[model samples]
Target: EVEQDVPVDIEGEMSNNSLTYFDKHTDSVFAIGHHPNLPLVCTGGGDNLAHLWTSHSQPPKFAGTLTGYGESVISCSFTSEGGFLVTADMSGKVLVHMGQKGGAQWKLASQMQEVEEIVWLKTHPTIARTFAFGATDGSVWCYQINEQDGSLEQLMSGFVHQQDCSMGEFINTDKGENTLELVTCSLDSTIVAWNCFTGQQLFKITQAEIKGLEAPWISLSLAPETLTKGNSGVVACGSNNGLLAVINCNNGGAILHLSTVIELKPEQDELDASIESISWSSKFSLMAIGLVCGEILLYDTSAWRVRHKFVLEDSVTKLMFDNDDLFASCINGKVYQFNARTGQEKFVCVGHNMGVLDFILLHPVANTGTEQKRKVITAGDEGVSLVFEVPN
Candidate 1:
């Protein structure tokens, strides 16, 4: 028996949606993530609610719903192994949840209200049971979830910047000495890396160190392991002034070697947006940088030259790599998939009346007649979530 609320069919109309969650939030949906090993999906919104539902199918099934927040749920993320699902709110409440072992039924494992405000929640790249979040107070916190007992344990936390920690990523084990090394960029105009368990700062660099570039950052990304052209632990930091910093994170007390990439020329528009999202691909020596001005630049990592530039109707919110294809979600309520090498638009996710707030690219589930293709799930400002299948 499914003890869940899927969607209340308010309007008697059918659109091009493969599956739709209608009016579940009663407000804009801000964050969304799909389970890696299951067809379960979760959404958070302005309604101060988070709901778990199945992947879109005709008459989609409901999984579960979670509520209890002083403000809007700003971030929702799931661990790689699907052992834990974490959600955070604007007013600083964070929840750790565990499912009923292969079932959709879930229970809250732990809850905390430590920071003044949370900005983002991300799961460790390889450490499936561990997760971390950045806060507006320039702090970062890491925790690991116990698989069997459903308990949350804090590993460490630190005030790593002078302002809000905007974006972060974990250095992989093989690339660095510490398995749990975390790197973050902040609006305070600095980049820092530290050990997650021991809380030891590894390296730090500021705007003054980079020379001739603005440093207030919005997003940062590490090069995939295939960045074998030079140093191993390289990170690309995108700033508010359309400047980029390419630094080696494992410099170990020495002065960071900085290079100016994407320096704004005099003719560049002064009113256009800077940077919003960045993603490095492992399948190719290419990096995709999304701008607030509705442009995506694919750069050749060796020369840092723009190989292809893709344009959209609105700002690009997120960029991700699925094999050799680059997937980008935008504020125009559309998602685009492009071939990384050729810049060919392979697929498009259509059918949203308002701007999209968040999205996830999911693997094809079995017996859905989409076993050979992938699916793009988009959640929007109009309180709607749609599932679109990519053509094979």
Candidate 2:
């Protein structure tokens, strides 16, 4: 693996301190979540507890703590409108805590553990109290909370892959009418789509279906158009070997040509190691592919061609989009914001002492109940988390 010191931005990193920072976690941070409609944040890490923090505070006031887990919490997410917060540990223990209406306190409402190891957990965007998760056993499980008592109700479950399931997304074909399906990718070189209601496999694709798209895929990004345009099940998936392929989950899960973005450089002699992260910006119609080799390739959805290629000083660990603005967090202990349309490096947000493992962009609610302000919350191997403000 290629390893080199990424030059530090002393001036840039110094400016990020103008906002606010805190050091409450005694262990490395691995999971993070922000309330969809409130000024609250929940962070979990090597520490077995998830701490609720106030986003609008001067020193990041600790609001509450979610406890009773056997191991480090690795994944967490909040349901739409932030009614419930879900946390999953490395050992597959899942806990649901109810958040008060105004982001005051949280208490355990439901809990479950089945699979041996959990990799990811996320709440359905449109379905209330419903969330799904992927496990090392290659199984996917979804549960809906009984709104009356906050009890867990099994909605769907399946052992969809032969190896570890890395990540997944909940999608709807009826356009907000229902949580109809879920698409999951695995380290076993397969992608599967399941019926959310029936727990049946709708379709699956392998390396055989898309030539040259060798997928021991570790990540997948869904096109945001699926929420607006019902038939678009396009997913931009990346392989450990540096190949990028697009498949339509609504169809037979075949390549859309629509496929094939990055060509592996054979003569360069070694594989990329991994396409560590992939993110899609629906507003700009751009698919940002991140590599452990320190490159970020922005693909134009219209032609599926590389529109902009930028390199970080270190491995790009995560890429996210706040509207059309693309943010890349690196192993170099820094985060960058780039203009999606012009390829301009706008600003850098820096604070973490080492590689950042998790982050979230929050648009705080205004007095009118409208999201009007922006903030970035980041935590990582550093055992410290920072909350910083940006202009509206």
Candidate 3:
């Protein structure tokens, strides 16, 4: 359990092309990376290989493969411009890959080789040459790409927590300089910010007043700065105690002042609603948080409150936003989309036989002169991937 713009047929392939197997990954898929501007996507599985595919096709075609990992590939990321790919395995090894005319090539760039495990990998949103990887030892390492030999140069290392790091996300600040800030949340019950360029610890936020709330946070998300009040940095952290807090990060500067905190209350006598995932919409001021109790809450950034809550049949493993609609993937092998504002179900699709481990929604490119369709890619313990056309 872990973890595209094209014009194609939406109706014809929804049923026939719903499920496809790679015949490679013999175990569960843990990571997936999609190019920002291309129809290419990469998936990493327990078989220690990352597969690249032309995802825009009707049935999808395998393009390339990345190997050399001795452990399960846990995290994978693509550069913003699709120039390179970065993958990390459970053994703390990182690989950098590039696409070639014949196929694709990769080289081992960094290896912690310690007892620590690499949990997450993220590339800068605007900078194609920079990327970061976080480990279980609460260490974050940033690297810059070598344009000459396609190697990676270590830029800096940061440590701010005492427990495992959950995830790290890069936020593009509104300042005219096109600056980027890295925000990381940890299971140590803290959220910290760091200067990407200088590797300086900005500030940290910790919860100190919750009674009997010993649960660690597992997920975090940030609303676009422009959508919140005063253009302040607003981040949502979901904890294992079933609490979701929306904190307004003041000034978007080095000093991460959490000016305000709002906690979303659960409905009824719900207990042990540990949050597992969080997502924010790119085109709307909406945030979705998935809970271990099989519920997903969609919140509006304007009011800083939950607008809709949908309870599924099993625990929610992943949550994603597509425009104004939100997709919820459950442990029951089902995925559902709902209107973020009204809580109206749009469609329900089966993801995998075991469970929905990870998924992504790709929007077809406009003006392609073909059927502008929406596609969903899902992977699970079945050791294969599935592509589904969103019913129009």
Which candidate number maximizes TM-score? 2
Put down candidate 2 lDDT per residue, 186-233, tens digits, no spaces: 977888998877999889887677663556777877787732265557
- TM-score of each model, paired residue for residue: 0.87, 0.89, 0.84
Residues 1-392 of candidate 1: C-alpha lDDT, one tens digit per residue: 22232221111122564545545878998889777787888899999999888875544587778877778888788886787888899988998888776757778888889898888878876677888888999898988888886687888788868889988887754553347878888987888887888877888877677664566888878777677554557777788767766767767523333443344567876434467888888888888888877778777777766777777878888898878888888888777888887777876676887877777877755765545567778778887888777755
Q: Write the per-residue lDDT of candidate 3 for residues 188-207, one digit (tens) a residue.
A: 77777777778877767665
TM-score, candidate number 3: 0.84
Q: Which ten residues in a row have the lowest lDDT in candidate 2?
A: 1-10
Stretches of model 3 off by over 4 angstroms after superposition: 1-21, 102-115, 173-178, 209-215, 229-232, 252-271, 368-371
What does the lDDT read for residue 169 in candidate 2? 81
Q: Which ten residues in a row have the lowest lDDT in candidate 1?
A: 5-14
The residue-level lDDT of candidate 1 at 108 comes to 87
